[PDB]
Amino acid sequence: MIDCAIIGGGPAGLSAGLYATRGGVKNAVLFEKGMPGGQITGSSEIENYPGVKEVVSGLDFMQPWQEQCFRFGLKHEMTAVQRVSKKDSHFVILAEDGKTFEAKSVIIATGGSPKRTGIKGESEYWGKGVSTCATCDGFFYKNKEVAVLGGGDTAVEEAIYLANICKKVYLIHRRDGFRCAPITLEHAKNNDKIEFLTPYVVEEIKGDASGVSSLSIKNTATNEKRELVVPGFFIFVGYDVNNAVLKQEDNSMLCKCDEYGSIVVDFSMKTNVQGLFAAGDIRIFAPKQVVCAASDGATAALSVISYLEHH
Amino acid sequence: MIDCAIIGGGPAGLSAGLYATRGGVKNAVLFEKGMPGGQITGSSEIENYPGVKEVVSGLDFMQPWQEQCFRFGLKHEMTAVQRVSKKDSHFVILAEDGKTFEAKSVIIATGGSPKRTGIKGESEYWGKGVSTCATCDGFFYKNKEVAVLGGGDTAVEEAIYLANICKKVYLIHRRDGFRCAPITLEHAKNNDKIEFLTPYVVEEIKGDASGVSSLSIKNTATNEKRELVVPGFFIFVGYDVNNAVLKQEDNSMLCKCDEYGSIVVDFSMKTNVQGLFAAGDIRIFAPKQVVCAASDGATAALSVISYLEHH
């Protein structure tokens, strides 16, 4: 049987694979549903990963992780995992095509992803002024005006944050009400760098071959239109954790999760189930940065190594 | 005053400085007691930092971190900090020569240090076959022989860990009995790849250009000098956390610590003191890897940014 099954090949899974294998686990298998590297791969540039000084596309950034993380004997399975279950004191991995794999320990490194909006120009201008990460990209817009789209905590919090960097922030929402914490909303209503554009819809993201120049918006109260000139547009429209592999046949969850579906872990990346670990954007309080995910992967692998030593 | 004072310029403080400064903190100051990079600087070879494909000394590995982490406005003070104290709603940073600095927030990123033995050859060979890190260096002696010095749980755990990677592990201790949990001693004694050398004392560590090649050892009962040929020597003789900066005039500690001196934090690198955060080997459950310290720094800076918005 597999000693350790790593589900997901982003930074968390790749680091887990590096560490497990370098730590003497002889049969570690990384499961990836096609295209190693994870979310960063959609980025046109990453510059805040500590210790890598060259600014380069997410795909180029991740590509040396392939030969390094596989250098010490890691194996691959190219397949979408459907489900992980507990069986006696081990685990069963069910592949979506119906094949099965058993493993002594499992690391869930399945991450998540930002909801998209499907507004016209979103895909065309993505990385040229359309963004999903204020931490990653907010600094490029240092003395400028920027727009934020969204209704919950992340949207309002990110508008406060960008208001600290940018000359001005338009906060665009379809409703006068925000599905977020009321005190954070009060801070934003009392921050003079944030103009609220409510109730609005973004009808098109417009610009030229260098990226965004403006948004076509409509007030749904009056239907008056407006062309809003901004180099930067941040969308914070919800996040989906890739939970699905946790769901059992009787619809129960494999391990304890928080009320948003993230997996509960302690500082050693352990879940409440013995021999099951989690790492990356999938776990509670994940800061959602590559270094963070990589760190989790390393610490989960170290935990696996101790676990296999004792069982 | 200073927005954020970062105490320590190892991977933790470096990445905290990167993130804080890229996240819009206009006056972030890094305090370093002379020569950033931290502990890895003493190693002749690092290979397990995810995303960095070339194997390279610690000095060379850390060089690009200086350029990158200082690229966004980060300031420094080259001074040994003697104390951090709380005063009103801010912090007072007392330098060892009596200079004082005030800051709104503080990140403790002071790391730790293994205890050294002083066995002739310990400096000459430090990070060149003499190691304090089984995780970091074990894989180099993959199918090779190795010695471990120490009597606690950690010498004993690390010798079991190494026995799963190396052909043979010599476990050297100054007496016949051990300070570790009885159960873990049991496990060692049934580990056929682990050879106890007890009551022994290592008399000399010898090598050449490529590093450690042998140790001069001596049976303390018998007085026979063995010469032990091995290319790798691990030393687990204790660890100290760089706590000192936390001790107040009254002898109390600024913030909550565990039994060993490590600073208590939550998942967002928050201590129990408002405005005070910690990152790296200084904190509870730190794995003691560069990627982990760097992740704690990023997330401590992220918490600093939210704190400075609120306050």
Ligand SMILES: Cc1cc2nc3c(=O)[nH]c(=O)nc-3n(C[C@H](O)[C@H](O)[C@H](O)COP(=O)(O)OP(=O)(O)OC[C@H]3O[C@@H](n4cnc5c(N)ncnc54)[C@H](O)[C@@H]3O)c2cc1C
């Ligand atoms: C557009 C964009 C830009 C970003 N820019 C930066 C940046 O500049 N700096 C930074 O630090 N971070 C950035 N991030 C955030 C960063 O990408 C994530 O924090 C990081 O990738 C999380 O790593 P992970 O390993 O936990 O998950 P992921 O990267 O999400 O990867 C999980 C992997 O598992 C695979 N998987 C999922 N489910 C299954 C399954 N059922 N079976 C088999 N495989 C499965 C997926 O295909 C995926 O490859 C950016 C993110 C995005 C989306």
Ligand SMILES: Cc1cc2nc3c(=O)[nH]c(=O)nc-3n(C[C@H](O)[C@H](O)[C@H](O)COP(=O)(O)OP(=O)(O)OC[C@H]3O[C@@H](n4cnc5c(N)ncnc54)[C@H](O)[C@@H]3O)c2cc1C
């Ligand atoms: C021999 C060895 C080999 C290692 N190999 C690896 C490896 O291969 N891979 C890996 O990932 N990790 C490795 N590590 C562990 C890694 O180096 C540490 O985990 C990492 O450096 C911890 O980072 P840090 O920022 O918390 O602290 P440190 O690296 O210890 O940095 C703390 C910094 O704070 C400064 N400081 C302390 N006190 C004060 C003060 N009073 N005032 C001002 N400045 C102060 C120190 O001078 C130091 O620069 C190794 C460690 C050792 C000892």
